[PDB]
Amino acid sequence: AVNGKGMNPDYKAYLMAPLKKIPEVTNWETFENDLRWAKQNGFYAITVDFWWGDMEKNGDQQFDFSYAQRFAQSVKNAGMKMIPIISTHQCGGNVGDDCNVPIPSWVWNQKSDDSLYFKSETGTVNKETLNPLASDVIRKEYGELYTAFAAAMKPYKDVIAKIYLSGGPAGELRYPSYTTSDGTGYPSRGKFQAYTEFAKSKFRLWVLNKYGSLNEVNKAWGTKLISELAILPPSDGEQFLMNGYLSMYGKDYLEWYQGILENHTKLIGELAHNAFDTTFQVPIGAKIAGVHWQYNNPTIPHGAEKPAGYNDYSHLLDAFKSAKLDVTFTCLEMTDKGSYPEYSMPKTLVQNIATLANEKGIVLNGENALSIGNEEEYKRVAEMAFNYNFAGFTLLRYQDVMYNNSLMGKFKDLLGVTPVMQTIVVKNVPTTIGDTVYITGNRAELGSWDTKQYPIQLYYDSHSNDWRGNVVLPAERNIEFKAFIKSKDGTVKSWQTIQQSWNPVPLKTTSHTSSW
Ligand SMILES: OC[C@H]1O[C@@H](O)[C@H](O)[C@@H](O)[C@@H]1O
Ligand SMILES: [Ca+2]
């Protein structure tokens, strides 16, 4: 893995449940047989959306957790764990959504203004999730929902592995900047979503708060606005993405635009911890969308991420850290293209995000963006997951492998693995001052024969006078590997003579010993 390390010892595989209720897709008894089958294939838990629209349908505090409780009972019956997603977003409308569960209708009646929803640059109204600007409504409703959910799930504490929160549309922390109705679906640039009157006033007040008055704002921006009402979000979104973002005004607007998401993160994080910590004591996480198109566009750099709210990933991730939330990223199965007209760089996106999270010490989890129909994608997911310290991977979605034994078998082999600590010992390594010893092998867990950035480093044991290391390998899988020496300048000096193997890696901790 990156930086001479191996795979994450805590790595687990999870499976996403269908979007519709189980009884609408199959039956409870069959569902239980299915769970035992997934467990047989390396899946540790099933993640599942519990829709706000289902749980607080009829009115304020008129809760219904009966489905969630029944689901949990079946999970307990099958001997599995589950990861609930408190889905405060709408099901339906997003790519791959076979369902229709909008958020409770009574919610929209809580406000007379337009503070609750989104309005794009061109006046497109979005109502699939509450506007994070309305933190007063969010604090009340989410606080109430999280607290009631905790009490209802208390009896099933034992089968709950962790909790996922919904930070926005499709369960991702972002703005609904890419939609067909708004004419911003992939691979087009996105549109900013701060055009409600409420959003304009908030931006305005944020600016005057930072500067004090219009005379200071004009000084800072080098502008000549005549009144405070002239303080507005970008009039031309494309021109803004083209050059507007470079100005002090642009930097300020993007700081505020993204900041709303960071504050939201800290709020829902505080509410979640308060509601679940003392009872479940499990990790809580949220998701960041993988907006890979328009990434390397030369005229509108990152034209899709920015309108979604992602301007500075490092500062965004700092919010998760302070909120005590684990992060889930997506697109692990994709490769960089970076060509016109899509300018899609999914792999680069993932590598950078993983790097930031790892340096900040944020637990990292991954998902595939689209359904996988070939083992080649499983291979791509494996490379990223096992070399970038991912603590977990969640497969979208249930039906794909549940009804395809061939795909299920390939998943088990490549990703449904159990990490086991093993000691690799290599004798007689002809090193000189400055030389370092590494090992690389055939599987993604071993760096796939890469010697540049994925090899696993060994260390000299002054006592036993040899090179060894406590390497984490996938249990019960056949592996092939060879040790090699790297010179001080970082180049490969030589390779171990005979190729080593472990068929398979034992389930219990042992040690593989070989001579150079
Ligand atoms: O099942 C997890 C997530 O899957 C996505 O494909 C859906 O759009 C989300 O609404 C859902 O929360
Ligand atoms: Ca309520």
Residue 103 DSSP code: -
Q: Which ligand is nearest to the CA of 139?
A: 2
Q: How far apart are alpha carbons 45 and 51 in whole angstroms? A: 19
Lookup result for tokens 């899709």 = 304
CATH topology of domain 417-516: Immunoglobulin-like (2.60.40)
Amino acid at the residue 172:
E
Atom of ligand 1 nearest to the CA of 48: 1
Q: For residue 306, give every residue at least 6 positions away whose Cβ sits within 8 Å of its Cβ, in sequence order, or none.
A: 190, 241, 245, 254
Cα–Cα distance measured from residue 37 to residue 409, given in angstroms and rounded to the nearest whole number: 11
Question: What's the first-to-final CA gap in the chain, in angstroms?
Answer: 22
Q: Could you give the dihedral angle defined by the CA atoms of residues 325, 475, 385 and 264, in that order, rounded to the nearest 10 degrees?
A: -10
Nearest to 407 by CA among 364, 378, 429: 378
- Tokens 């890696």 correspond to 505
Q: With CA atoms as reference, report the closest residue to 470 among 424, 512, 506.
A: 424
Q: Which atom of ligand 1 lies at the shortest distance from residue 96's CA?
A: 6
Residue 324's identity, in one-letter code, is K
Taking the centre of ligand 1 as the mean of its atom positions, its distance from the CA of residue 129, in whole angstroms, is: 13
Atom number, ligand 1, closest to the C-alpha of residue 17: 1
Q: What is the DSSP string of 389-447?
A: T-SEEEES-HHHHHT-HHHHHHHHHHTS--EEEEEEEEE-----TT-EEEEEESSGGGT
Q: What are the backbone angles phi and psi of residue 162, rounded to the nearest 5°? A: -175, 170
Residue 432 structure tokens: 């000189």
Burial class for 424, CB neighbours closer than 10 Å (0-12, 13-18, 19+) = buried
* Residue 432: Cβ-neighbour burial (10 angstroms; 0-12, 13-18, 19+): exposed
Residue 454: exposed, middle, or buried by beta-carbon count in 10 A (0-12, 13-18, 19+)?
buried
> Which position has the token pair 């008055």?
213
Cα(261) to ligand 1 centroid in Å equals 19
Is the separation of the CB atoms in 231 and 296 below 8 Å? no
Structure tokens at 337: 């293209």
For the Cβ of 87 lying below 6 angstroms from any atom of ligand 1, the answer is yes
Decide whether any atom of ligand 1 lies within 6 Å of the 91 Cβ: yes
d(CA 452, CA 425): 22
Atom of ligand 1 nearest to the CA of 166: 12
Q: Which ligand is nearest to the CA of 85?
A: 1
Torsion sign across C-alpha atoms 245, 249, 252, 257: negative
Could you say which DSSP state residue 57 is in?
-
Residue pair 83/130 in contact by the 8 Å Cβ criterion? no
Report CA(151)–ligand 2 centroid distance (Å).
14
- Tell me which residue of 111, 22, 31, 110 sits closest to 68, measured CA to CA: 22
The domain made up of 1-416 is a member of CATH 3.20.20.80: yes
The alpha-helical segments, DSSP class H, found in 432-495 are none
Residue with the two structure tokens 């687990």: 12
The counts of H helices and E strands in the chain are: 15, 19
State the span(s) of the chain assigned CATH 3.20.20.80.
1-416
Half-sphere exposure (Cβ direction) of 393: Cα atoms closer than 13 Å = 32
Tokens of 326: 């684990």
Resolution (A): 2.1
Closest CA to 363 of 388, 382, 396, 335: 388
Distance (Å, whole) CA 116 – CA 94: 20
Q: Which residues is 481 bridged to in the sheet?
A: 441, 500
Q: How far is the CA of 275 from the centre of ligand 1 (A)?
A: 23
CA distance 190 to 304: 5
Q: What is the CA radius of gyration of the chain?
A: 25
16 lines ligand 1 (CB under 6 A): yes
Distance in Å, CA 56 to ligand 2 centroid: 7
What's the DSSP call for residue 70?
H
Q: Binding site for Ca(2+), residues?
A: 56, 60-61, 141, 144
Query: Number of C-alpha atoms within 13 angstroms, CB side, residue 206?
Result: 19
Ligand 1 pocket check for 261: Cβ under 6 Å: no
Distance in angstroms (rounded) separating the CA atoms of residues 340 and 487: 41
Q: Start-end ranges of CATH 2.60.40.10 in the chain?
A: 417-516
CA distance 454 to 448: 8
* Distance (Å, whole) CA 3 – CA 358: 11
Q: At residue 495, what is the residue type?
A: W
Helix, strand and coil in the chain, % to nearest 5: 40, 20, 45
The amino acid sitting at 402 is: M
Q: Which ligand is nearest to the CA of 397?
A: 1
| Alpha carbons 383 and 454: distance in angstroms, whole number | 10
Q: What are the DSSP calls for 232-271, one per residue?
A: -S-SSHHHHHHTGGGSHHHHHHHHHHHHHHHHHHHHHHHH
Looking at ligand 1, which residue's alpha carbon is closest to its atom 7? 170
Catalytic residues: 172, 367
Say how far apart CA 179 and CA 191 lie, in whole Å.
9
Q: How many CB atoms lie within 10 A of CB 59?
A: 12
Contact 322, 271 (CB under 8 A): no
184 lines ligand 1 (CB under 6 A): no
Question: Which residue has its alpha carbon closest to ligand 1 atom 5?
Answer: 170
Q: Provide the pairing of β-strand 479-486 with 492-495.
A: antiparallel
Nearest CA residue ID for atom 8, ligand 1: 170
Tokens read off for 211:
């500067």
